[PDB]
Design a protein around this ligand. Structure first.
Ligand SMILES: Nc1ncnc2c1ncn2[C@@H]1O[C@H](COP(=O)(O)OP(=O)(O)O)[C@@H](O)[C@H]1O
Lengths: 161, 109, 459, 232, 600, 459
């Protein structure tokens, strides 16, 4: 009795150990993705375009008459442009005049890779569209494909229902 | 069979409690009759008439204990449960009535 | 996928019992999941059970104790509770919320399935036609189990229904003369009960094929009504996408019913009996009917929704509504347990609604159905004789009655009594049946045709 | 004051719509059963219905006549009058190859018309039995069973055309029992088919019961079927 | 033409901007276009009952207003098919989506438009002919068993302008063209009828013909009729589904509509697997059963709102075939699940409940449902006769026949097939109580029985008296111990057992009890009653003599007769036909008569 | 003459079940009538249940299906549903709203009467006395019926209450030492019963004096709320203006009570017992009490309403409130029916309040009152003896108890059992009574004075 229960415990712990190692591999990839995104942010000619999208995207999700755009101070010159080019479009896509201001007193933490967050007038409704939030928001949904892409498909799965 | 099949009511609850008390008294009185017959029977041990009287009395006592009262108790417990179920649906309706009144009052303000 | 950023709200309108009501919500979605953070950093989740205009009613799983009105921060995921599922969940232990509690990692999903599931198209559902050998004569003989069948054990507090379920997990095979993946949902139970099963699964050497979901007595009562869905959702992945035969055991379903009743009272829903929601049946069907084989795929799900009967009341809504949905029940009682009979399975109030097709020529032995039906007649009559003899006395009985008392006495100790580790075959069970039937003369075995008696009875 | 008349059981508009149809139906049945208008007695018996048909009336004009009471607008009385004709129609059509004499048709009309409840009468049962036999043979392979049933069916049709269905003539009564038995008889059980058929043929008083009933071509197939069966 | 969703509480959705919407119009809720039906109107806001799961529906989703009410498509292609609760064919969904799950928002035609039907006109119509509602202007050969009559829909009439010649036509073509007042109408083979409206008939007639059931009890003692209504309020395990399936398999009806409303999913699969393997000879040819049946699946784990549509869809189909001159015997295996749906919706609606939480209008829904049954004279010039019978199960909680659904049902149905859980526990199937059951059609069928049998009626009476006397004695025997019983009473008690064990119960999953032809039921009953009379006479003529024939004397002398009488069930009518069974029963009668002559 | 044009509104506020709510209505009149024109041209009617300001709640009789909230036109009649009545309404069949169903014309308004009823001054009410000889021994002997009485027949589902009511109708008459007009209100009656009564009236040649109001089980359930008021309104015209004697039959007050419950729930009123409106008592009193005689008239109304008792009880609010209003009952039982006894009437829980005065010297027989009481007591005792026998056995009874048991068996066989096509007179019924009483020695007949016994008992 003792021999087989001990081997059961050993095999169960070995299974958990390799599973933990697999999760470390997934984490290393995601932490590399963060570093790759930072390198992209450093490129003004692509980051300004990213910001153009990020600001307008948040505006469509809130659909409020008054907006407050919060960013880290370092990126303020580009967020300012992102808003300026976003409003003419917003007033066309929604046919609603929106007063969009940038918060010059509150800023995002300096350790945020990039992006903006937008608050409504009373700061009770906010959309978080920074790079860390986007990476997890997508990565958590694409994970089934990463699992296969890195470790292979499960040979025992025949149907996709 | 399993129940006397009297529709759940407060009247039925009262009747069953009176019926149960009667059955319990009959059980005890017949048990005392049996005990008195058993003592006389053992003292003598007009003999076979006592053996038949004891078996007949004990059979009736056993039926009260194993058939008639269990059936009264099951009926009484059934009635009690059904009465609480009726109480609940009255509570439910009254709660919704109180909430609807509150809603109507707010609309008027 | 959902590419748009999710919104976060600090617009809680008010809190009433377990329900947190938000206002100013953009295009609320019904049955979407909301994540909320309390002022002290505690994270909790809930589901939108109602939307109206800009308002939404969120039922919080962990509870509403400590929920604020001004500092509470909520975000809407934008979808329903779809949960990660993977084949390698077998050998893992999860809580009732779907999170690991075995110090392993989170699930590395192969897909995300809707916890609510979908009904299986009755045109593609294939009727079960295979028998599982439980090794328990009280079951394999008189109430056979089919693969894909739904058979709860009706029990009562203090009875060894946990031992029977554990026994079934180890010695459940086939009569085709096989390793089942077991999903065990431990909800509303104490530590010792959950540890009992976990230890037994390791003792059996099968833990690598067992997935556990735990929600203990000291865990939130709202999570107790998704745990079954989490277990079954995993079972559906394994059975219908990976063609693995799965055995799903749900511990005292009465803790599910009580958790549901609490929610019904909180939302002021229309009661049925004993305060339970008038839709209790529909909700149970959503859980129970996630079972059976599907044509064209080699998997199956078999369920054993064991439940405790409050006060041994067989008509209590829990066993009543279950009895209407499942293919019968095994049913244990106290009259057998109080005499140290194991397993304490009472065949008389039990039935298996698929037995008629899983036994007989080509399945077990051609006399199977005939032996079972006559044993039922003899057992019930013996009980009827005791009911009479308790009043009239042994002297009032004739030889026709004593035979049933002899049968009843030998039946319970030879046929039902086995022991936790007694594994009998279905063929041995029938042979025992005949040994008891041979107590009576041929003329009294009135449920069995002479075309069967003439072959089997003489032996 | 006419919010919901529900005349008998139909909305007033639906009731009168049924009356208009029934009038047209009788007109169609009369033209189908008596293309030459020979049944003078019966056509007069429906004169109050046929006056509204066989004429250039529009559907709406007949519907108006019903609402205004200018035609037999009693649907229940009109229905009975229709049925005692529909049953006569199927009686004649179900025996198509053998026409009744005009005198027999009028006799059958009166016998059915005078019945307290034609639908449940023996007349209806006999017609249902005949149609079960004649409908099956509308589309059937020339199998031993089907050739034997065909031969007996033509005799049944002949005898009905001569006698009708009012008298319990032993000829038609035996043929009904034998025909329904053979039709029910399993298609593969040929030995009983030949046994039953031969028993019939040598029970009838005629030396050749089919002489003049069925054509020579069917007689050639009928006899060849028996010849092959008895060959080995 | 659209509204917008305002809120969702589950199966009930509230929508706004629907000022012109009427009650009981269909709507399409959500971007998946979920099927629902308007229940309430509050200003320009509508309350919508949705027949599909509402999870994922958002506030602001469009709602399409459809002028047509909930309706059923009626035409060829129904028989042999299985439908969901709103008439979407499951074999067509599974053949198109390749899935095993039923998707939400599936828009599939009720009847396939690809099949080329064989159509023959009536040959009695001409251009200029006057045609009215219910008239048949052609036939489609769906299969060899059921001839599908193509009727002019009710509320339509006019002159015929064109009739399609015989040939091959599908359900999208035009078969009949008719005109009324300038307006012309083009009809195909498929008509649409609101499912909540009763199809009109010429006359509702009394039911005077048995509905044959493949059971000894549920026929000999408690007959059902063609067009009648019965209830089976059995507790779980009582075997009421088996009684329903037995009636479906082996009956004298022409069309069976089986409605699984809240039923276990495995039960509908059991029908689809087993039925194709059953036989029913037509005219010497063996044919499958499915060609004369149709079934609706709305299983317990499907949307609860759909349970109402399922019940009405089923009966609407039944009426359709009734109108064509067929005898229909539909059976809904639940009823309580429908009333349960009404309770759940009423709750979400915040309506004031009545008895035990059920809507006050529960009785109204059941009354109007069951009254659509009956033998009728059909509308239509061809003078058809049809019927719809309804055999509906009920599921009282705990087996207590006190709930609003069982109580209301018993006030509606004319045949009561009560089941006793305590008989099912003993596997005494069918578990019919036979003490609380009744049939109000006994007098109606007395004419039938005298015409064809005669002997049956006095046998039915004697059997009931024996069973009642046994109950009257059992009540006191339990207390006395069989000490004070007269010899005439011991015979009654033992013959009553003989009847109970060998006559009233039968194993429906055997080659010999799966179907019990009526002649066999009355045959074996005659012998059992004949024994009763001879055994009772034997003691009555000897009790006062110098030797009384007590039970123990006849029991030992005639033990072979008592065993033979018990074996009478094991006759296998398919292997041993009528001739052998009647001869065998006659032999037992002779054996009894000879033994009595040697005894007395 | 109300020569004022009617207003028609499209200002529909909403529709909720059987109720249609209108707004912007000018001076709404309570209990007014509104004609509804549906978008498709369908015409329906309804009656106002309440008014408040510019809003009114309309009760729609034919049903609300198909009504929208935009186009439906609502015409206010300006008056209360006063119904056309005529003496020539006999020989006609109307539907539940008083419209022709027999292919005849709309009743010509000889006059109009407010169906709500005009209260009759109790000072002018004439006490009923003359006995109606119904032919049924259970009624003519014990619970006799006076002309102008109010004696409903209670029954449960499945019992032959339709046969008893039909038998009374065709056998009705006075005790002799010319006949009744029938007003028959069918409320929720199935087609099989509807033709049962219609055919029985025709076969006996009664239709010349019968007016039927048929609201069938498949007809609208709101309409039947007025149906009984339309029937009695005609009865009141015929009895009090046309000097006819009218027997009024109400096929089920239970389907009527359910119709009231549906409406009461629809307007979210506070219920009483079992969900019925707290005012059920009044709604019944205003129908039941439309009976009796009045000074100056020769006609009369006799009511014999029928009530199905849910769950076979007699404490259900419907029969409970009826019992408080009507003057006794018949109460058709089930235990007698199961024993093939017809009419299966149980004499113990059934009384007739006017019986004590409608019998005796000058009306029936000197001893009528004494025979009734003695038979009643004998039956009651016999039932108590039967209750004991079931426990102690037939061997534990004394000689007197056996006399009551013999009485009980012969009483039901010879007295109560009659047959549906045989009528017996009050004098024949009493003679049978005496045959049953003569089972006992005179000393045991303690409820009959010695003078009565000496006159009749020895005969
Ligand atoms: N008439 C019958 N003949 C034989 N076995 C039966 C019969 N009725 C029920 N049974 C058995 O009992 C079981 C219970 O019947 P079922 O219809 O499932 O119960 P329910 O009343 O819950 O619908 C069946 O599956 C079958 O094994």
């Amino acid at each position: 009795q003792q021999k087989k229960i001990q081997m059961s415990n050993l095999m169960n712990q070995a299974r958990l150990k390799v599973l933990r190692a697999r999760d470390d591999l997934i984490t290393d990839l995601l932490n590399e993705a963060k570093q790759r995104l930072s390198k992209v942010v450093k490129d003004t000619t692509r980051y300004q375009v990213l910001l153009d999208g990020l600001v307008l995207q948040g505006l469509y999700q809130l659909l409020e008459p008054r907006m407050i755009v919060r960013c880290r101070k370092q990126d303020f010159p580009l967020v300012k442009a992102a808003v300026q080019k976003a409003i003419p479009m917003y007033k066309i896509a929604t046919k609603k005049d929106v007063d969009v201001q940038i918060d010059l007193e509150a800023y995002l933490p300096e350790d945020i890779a990039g992006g903006v967050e937008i608050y409504n007038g009373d700061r009770k409704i906010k959309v978080s569209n920074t790079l860390e939030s986007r990476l997890d928001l997508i990565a958590q949904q694409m994970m089934p494909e990463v699992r296969g892409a890195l470790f292979g498909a499960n040979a025992n799965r025949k149907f996709l229902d | 069979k399993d129940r006397i099949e009297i529709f759940p009511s407060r009247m039925a609850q009262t009747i069953m409690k009176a019926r149960l008390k009667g059955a319990q008294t009959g059980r005890n009185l017949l048990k005392k009759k049996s005990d008195a017959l058993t003592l006389r029977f053992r003292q003598i041990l007009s003999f076979v008439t006592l053996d038949e009287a004891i078996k007949i009395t004990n059979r009736r006592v056993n039926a009260i204990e194993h058939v008639i009262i269990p059936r009264i108790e099951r009926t009484l417990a059934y009635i009690i449960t059904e009465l609480d179920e009726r109480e609940r649906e009255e509570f439910y309706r009254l709660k919704k009535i109180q909430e609807k009144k509150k809603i109507i009052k707010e609309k008027s303000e | 996928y959902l590419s748009q950023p999710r919104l976060t709200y600090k617009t809680v309108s008010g809190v009433n019992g377990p329900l947190v009501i938000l206002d100013h919500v953009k295009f609320p979605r019904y049955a979407e999941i909301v994540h909320l953070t309390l002022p002290d950093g505690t994270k909790r989740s809930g589901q939108v059970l109602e939307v109206s205009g800009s308002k939404a009613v969120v039922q919080v799983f962990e509870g509403t104790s400590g929920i604020d009105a001004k500092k509470t921060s909520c975000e809407f995921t934008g979808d329903i509770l779809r949960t990660p599922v993977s084949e390698d969940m077998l050998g893992r232990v999860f809580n009732g919320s779907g999170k690991p509690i075995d110090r392993g990692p989170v699930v590395l999903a192969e897909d995300f399935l809707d916890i609510m599931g979908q009904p299986i198209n009755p045109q593609c559902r294939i009727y079960p036609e295979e028998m599982i050998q439980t090794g328990i004569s009280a079951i394999d003989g008189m109430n056979s189990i089919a693969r894909g069948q739904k058979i709860p054990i009706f029990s009562a507090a203090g009875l060894p229904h946990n031992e029977i379920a554990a026994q079934i997990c180890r010695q459940a095979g086939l009569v085709k003369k096989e390793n089942f993946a077991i999903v065990f949902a431990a909800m509303g139970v104490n530590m010792e009960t959950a540890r009992f099963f976990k230890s037994d699964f390791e003792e059996n050497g099968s833990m690598d094929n067992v997935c556990l979901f735990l929600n203990l007595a000291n865990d939130p009562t709202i999570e107790r009504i998704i745990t079954p869905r989490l277990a079954l959702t995993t079972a559906e992945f394994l059975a219908y996408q990976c063609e693995k035969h799965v055995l799903v055991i749900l511990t005292d379903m009465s803790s599910y019913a009580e958790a549901l009743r609490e929610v019904s009272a909180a939302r002021e829903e229309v009661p049925g009996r004993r305060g339970f929601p008038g839709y209790m049946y529909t909700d149970l069907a959503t859980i129970y009917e996630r079972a059976g084989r599907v044509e064209g795929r080699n998997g199956s799900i078999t369920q054993i929704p064991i439940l405790t009967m409050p006060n041994d009341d067989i008509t209590h809504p829990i066993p009543d509504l279950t009895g209407y949905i499942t293919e019968g029940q095994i049913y244990v009682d106290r009259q057998l347990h109080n005499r140290q009979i194991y397993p304490p399975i009472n065949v008389l109030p039990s039935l298996s609604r698929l037995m008629k097709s899983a036994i007989g020529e080509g399945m077990t032995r051609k006399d199977h159905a005939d032996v079972s039906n006559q044993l039922y007649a003899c057992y019930a009559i013996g009980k009827d004789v005791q009911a009479m003899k308790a009043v009239v006395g042994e002297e009032a009985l004739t030889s026709d009655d004593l035979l049933y008392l002899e049968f009843l006495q030998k039946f319970e100790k030879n046929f039902i009594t086995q022991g936790p580790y007694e594994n009998r075959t279905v063929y041995e069970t029938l042979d025992i049946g005949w040994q008891l039937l041979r107590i009576f003369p041929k003329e009294m075995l009135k449920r069995i045709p002479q075309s069967t008696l003439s072959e089997f009875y003489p032996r | 004051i006419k919010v919901g008349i529900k005349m008998g059981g139909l909305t007033s508009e639906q009731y009168h719509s049924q009356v208009v149809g029934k009038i047209g139906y009788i007109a169609r049945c009369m033209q189908t059963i008596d293309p030459e208008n020979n049944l003078k007695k019966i056509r007069e018996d429906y004169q109050d219905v046929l006056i509204w048909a066989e004429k250039n009336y529009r559907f709406e004009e007949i519907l108006e006549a019903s609402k205004s009471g200018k035609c037999p607008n009693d649907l229940d009385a009109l229905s009975r009058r229709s049925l005692i004709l529909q049953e006569l129609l199927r009686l004649v059509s179900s025996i198509s190859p053998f026409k009744m004499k005009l005198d027999l048709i009028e006799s059958q009309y009166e016998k059915m018309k005078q019945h307290v409840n034609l639908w449940k009468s023996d007349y209806h049962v006999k017609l249902n039995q005949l149609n079960q036999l004649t409908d099956y043979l509308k589309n059937a392979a020339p199998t031993p069973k089907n050739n034997f049933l065909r031969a007996m069916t033509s005799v049944l049709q002949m005898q009905i055309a001569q006698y009708g269905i009012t008298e319990d003539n032993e000829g038609i009564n035996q043929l009904f029992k034998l025909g329904l038995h053979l039709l029910a008889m399993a298609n593969e059980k040929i030995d009983e088919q030949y046994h039953l058929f031969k028993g019939y043929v040598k029970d009838q008083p005629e030396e050749s019961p089919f002489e003049g009933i069925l054509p020579a071509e069917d007689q050639k197939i009928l006899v060849k079927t028996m010849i092959d069966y008895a060959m080995p | 033409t659209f509204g917008y969703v305002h809120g969702v509480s589950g199966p009930v959705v509230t929508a706004c901007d629907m000022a012109g919407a009427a009650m009981y119009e269909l709507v399409r809720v959500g971007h998946s276009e979920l099927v629902g039906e308007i229940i309430r109107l509050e200003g320009d806001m509508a309350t919508i009952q949705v027949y599909e799961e509402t999870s994922g529906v958002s506030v602001g989703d469009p709602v399409l207003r459809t002028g047509k009410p909930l309706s059923v498509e009626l035409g060829p292609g129904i028989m042999g098919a299985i439908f969901d609760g709103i008439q979407r064919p499951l074999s067509d969904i599974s053949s198109q989506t390749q899935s095993i799950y039923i998707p939400r928002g599936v828009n599939v035609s009720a009847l396939s438009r690809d099949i080329k039907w064989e159509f023959i006109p009536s040959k009695n119509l001409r251009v200029g002919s006057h045609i009215t509602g219910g008239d048949i202007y052609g036939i489609v050969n769906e299969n060899s068993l059921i001839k599908h009559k193509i009727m002019l829909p009710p509320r339509s009439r006019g002159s015929v302008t064109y009739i399609a010649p015989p040939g091959n036509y599908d359900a999208s073509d035009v078969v009949l063209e008719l005109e009324f007042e300038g307006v012309k109408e083009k009809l195909s083979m498929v008509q649409v009828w609101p499912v909540r409206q009763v199809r009109p008939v010429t006359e509702k007639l009394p039911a005077n013909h048995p509905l044959l059931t493949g059971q000894r009890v549920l026929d000999a003692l408690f007959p059902c009729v063609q067009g009648g209504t019965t209830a089976i309020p059995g507790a779980f395990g009582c075997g009421k589904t088996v009684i329903s399936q037995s009636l479906s398999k082996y009956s004298n009806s022409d069309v069976i509509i089986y409605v699984g409303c809240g039923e276990r999913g495995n039960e509908m699969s059991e029908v689809l697997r087993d039925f194709p393997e059953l036989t029913m000879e037509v005219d010497g040819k063996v044919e499958s059963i499915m060609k004369r049946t149709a079934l609706v699946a709305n299983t317990s784990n499907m949307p609860v709102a759909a349970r109402e549509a399922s019940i009405y869809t089923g009966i609407t189909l039944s009426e359709y075939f009734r109108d064509m001159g067929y005898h229909v015997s539909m059976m809904a295996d639940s009823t309580s699940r429908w009333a349960e749906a009404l309770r759940e919706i009423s709750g979400r609606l915040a309506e004031m409940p009545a008895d035990s939480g059920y809507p006050a209008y529960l009785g109204a829904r059941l009354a109007s449902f069951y009254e659509r049954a009956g033998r009728v004279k059909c509308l239509g010039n061809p003078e058809r006769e049809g019927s719809v019978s309804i055999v509906g199960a009920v599921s009282p909680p705990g087996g207590d026949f006190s709930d609003p659904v069982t109580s209301a049902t018993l006030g509606i149905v004319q045949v009561f097939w009560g089941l006793d859980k305590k008989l099912a526990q003993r596997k005494h199937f069918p578990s019919v109580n036979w003490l609380i059951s009744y049939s109000k059609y006994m007098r109606a069928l007395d004419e039938y029985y005298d015409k064809h049998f005669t002997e049956f009626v006095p046998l039915r009476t004697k059997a009931k008296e024996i069973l009642q006397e046994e109950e009257d004695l059992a009540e006191i025997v339990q207390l006395v111990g069989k000490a004070s019983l007269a010899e005439t009473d011991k015979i009654t008690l033992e013959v009553a057992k003989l009847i109970k064990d060998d006559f009233l119960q039968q194993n429906g999953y055997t080659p010999y009890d799966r179907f019990c032809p009526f002649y066999k039921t009355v045959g074996m009953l005659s012998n059992m009653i004949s024994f009763y009379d001879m055994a009772r006479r034997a003691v009555e003529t000897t009790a006062q003599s110098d030797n009384k024939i007590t039970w123990s004397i006849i029991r030992e002398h005639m033990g072979e007769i008592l065993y033979k009488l018990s074996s009478m069930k094991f006759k296998d009518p398919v292997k041993d036909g009528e001739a052998k069974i009647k001869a065998d029963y006659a032999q037992l009668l002779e054996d009894m008569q000879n033994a009595f002559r040697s005894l007395e």
